[PDB]
Amino acid sequence: MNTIAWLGRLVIERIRGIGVAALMLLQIIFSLPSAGGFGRFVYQMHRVGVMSLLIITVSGLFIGLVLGLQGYSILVNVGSESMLGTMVSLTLLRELAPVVAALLFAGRAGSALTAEIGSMKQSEQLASMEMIGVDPLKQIVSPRLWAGIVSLPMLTVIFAAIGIVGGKLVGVDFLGVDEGSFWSGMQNNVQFGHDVVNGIIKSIVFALLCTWIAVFQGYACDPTPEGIATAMTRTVVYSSLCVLGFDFVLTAVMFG
Amino acid sequence: LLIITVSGLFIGLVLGLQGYSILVNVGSESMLGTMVSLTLLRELAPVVAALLFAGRAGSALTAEIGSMKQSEQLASMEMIGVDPLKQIVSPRLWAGIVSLPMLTVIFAAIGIVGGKLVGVDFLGVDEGSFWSGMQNNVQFGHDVVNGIIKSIVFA
Amino acid sequence: SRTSELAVGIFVIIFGIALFFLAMKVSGLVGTNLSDGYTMKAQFDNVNGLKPRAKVTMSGVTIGRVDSITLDPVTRLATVTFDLDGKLTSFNAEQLKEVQKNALDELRYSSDYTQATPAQQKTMEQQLISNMNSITSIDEDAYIMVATNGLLGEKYLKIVPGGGLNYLKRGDTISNTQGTMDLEDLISKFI
Amino acid sequence: SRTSELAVGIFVIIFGIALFFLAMKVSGLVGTNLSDGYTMKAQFDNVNGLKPRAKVTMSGVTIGRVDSITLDPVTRLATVTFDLDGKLTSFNAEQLKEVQKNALDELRYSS
Amino acid sequence: SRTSELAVGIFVIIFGIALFFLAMKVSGLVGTNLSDGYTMKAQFDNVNGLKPRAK
Amino acid sequence: KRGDTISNTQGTMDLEDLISKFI
Amino acid sequence: KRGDTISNTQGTMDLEDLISKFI
């Protein structure tokens, strides 16, 4: 009864907020940014994207080295080492390069959008900005949000490119697989307009829900540096619940 | 705990969904239970369990200590006199060691039980060939035990 | 205006599940992607390895699903329940005009029209009014069988026409069935 | 400022290469297209397991694809629509006259 | 907000329980129970790789 | 000519047909 | 009856007798 009603109130308040973040989101994009916006916009790419680049190559190199390592050894027993190039491509492209690219991005830059705005909340460096007079929704939010949208499809292609080229390195350089059957296994089965293009349309709505939460949950948080970490998980928790919760609608609309 | 169940439920639903449809064309729907188990257990439940753990609690150990550095929370503790290496570090580090193998088993358990839900409840696969596919190929002392020894040095 | 954010916070979260069920149309697990589908049944003797949600083809065009597979031990036969997508196994204004004039000239020819009742004016409209009420495409001696999808595929119902002269409505039962093929008896009966 | 003009300009360098990798070394639309390609059609009985955009061959050479696979309830069949090539399937003018008077050799074929 | 709290709890609790139930059911025991399961026998010479709990 | 219809067609043959091929 | 032993059966043939019967 007591704790139950407590949790109820909790859920209600949470849902109420969420809605808010919607009311924030229109107010950022439905205004034309001024001069000086692009200069911070480049620096946010310098902050979010270029710093995120060194990570996803290594985890890109890894997963191809694993996925072409183990399925083949069971698959070679019947007749197929030529379908190695298909199974590495069609599971990275339509399944993992949307999903696992974001969970490394929600890791690095899904935090550093919150704690950089959890920065300006504790020392009132948000409040001073309003008091001098800017609006941080134009100043420190909108160049942050517009880099977050752009830079993730700019990475998840980069990710899967080394993802496939990684699995080539285990195949032809150590397992001795035929090069021609490797690539022409892919060429026949991986169309462009149905897989790589629809691997992007997954990665855009995986970029919006990951970066809009990580902006809002750093803005409307109380400046307590304990709860700056409980606000930190609600970036990651609500991202990973929704970046996985909206794969299953996006897999069904594309195919099935 | 609330995170790794959902991403645990997910990856089994995917890995048993797509490899089978190419594998069914020759003779094998009974090796579905093996390929889901032996790639989760010896390959992913060490790796992908940490990258969700380094996400949540790999941050909240830093920012909780990046808390006490900015307001000199740390410095006041030394000044009153404790040592935070005994006080606020050692109970943090000893939970971090313990709690990750306590999760990555929990992760892969729903990871396998997730892929059962797509198989027998939607793809109509035989239950007996499902489990006895695993019991012949997945030993305990070489896979599940050595899936833990990976997860300790990953923790 | 503190309830407004709350109201939009409901307005989004009920909308997100609504589109989430909108993807549950075309995904194919729940619901059918069939424009005015209609059920038919058939009775086999061997439905080995034939799951629900199977494929039903005419010559290679998938025109149906499989819903339930039932037995009846008093006769020890199988009974398959399936619906067909019909706007392409069902006729329309061109073909209904085509088939009505076809069978009344061919099946009801001088072998049949000049061996009949006294007034050949009411029965001529009887052959056409017995056909408008949801005729499908499938003749009187078309057979249904179980294929194997190539060499190592998975089983699916193959509807094969036999040409025939009379069709069947939405609710009937195909009377020319045969079970699957099996390598157990065949290698014994070959060696 | 000056590093930022470098470190995101070098980022759009790499993304363009990794898109070039997918387009021109992996997927089918890497130029797969013949000259004046015309279309024909044919009717079948078993088109079991035949996706659109398949291959068409004459001696094992990829001369075209399959466009659309329709059924017709007017006669209980399946009618395949496919486009061949126009150069590898039509004779050139030199090859035309080579067989045209040879068809006149076929026409005036004695009797 | 008595009403609010109560309502919130209600939905929450219901959902949670139902979910956990179904989940635990889709595995191991819980539900797995035939009806009128008698038992017959047969005796062969070469089973050859037959398994327990087959079909 | 272009746009004609090729005659004399025969479709695919599978495991459910190779029984009919021998006997 | 619910409890009997079905007398008339036949065992399965392995692939090895298939080899010997093949030649």
Author numbering:
A (entry chain D): 1 to 256
B (entry chain A): 53 to 207
C (entry chain K): 3 to 193
D (entry chain J): 3 to 113
E (entry chain L): 3 to 57
F (entry chain J), G (entry chain L): 171 to 193
What do the authors of the reporting publication say about this deposited model?
Consistent with the previous reported low-resolution A. baumannii MlaFEDB map8 and our E. coli MlaFEDB map9 (EMD-30355), the MlaF (cytoplasmic nucleotide-binding domain, NBD), MlaE (transmembrane domain), MlaD (periplasmic phospholipid-binding domain), and MlaB (cytoplasmic auxiliary domain) subunits are assembled in a stoichiometry of 2:2:6:2.
To understand the mechanism of glycerophospholipid translocation coupled with the conformational change, distinct conformations of MlaFEDB were trapped using sodium ortho-vanadate. Three individual conformations were classified and refined to 4.0, 3.6, and 4.0 Å, and were named Vtrans1, Vtrans2, and Vclose, respectively. The structure of Vclose shows the tight dimerization and close proximity of the NBD of MlaF subunits, caused by the trapping of ADP–vanadate or ATP at the ATP-binding sites comprising the Walker A, Walker B motifs, and the signature motif. No bound glycerophospholipid densities were observed in the central cavity in Vclose. The three vanadate-trapped structures of MlaFEDB reveal different levels of conformational rearrangement of MlaD and MlaE coupled with nucleotide binding and glycerophospholipid translocation.
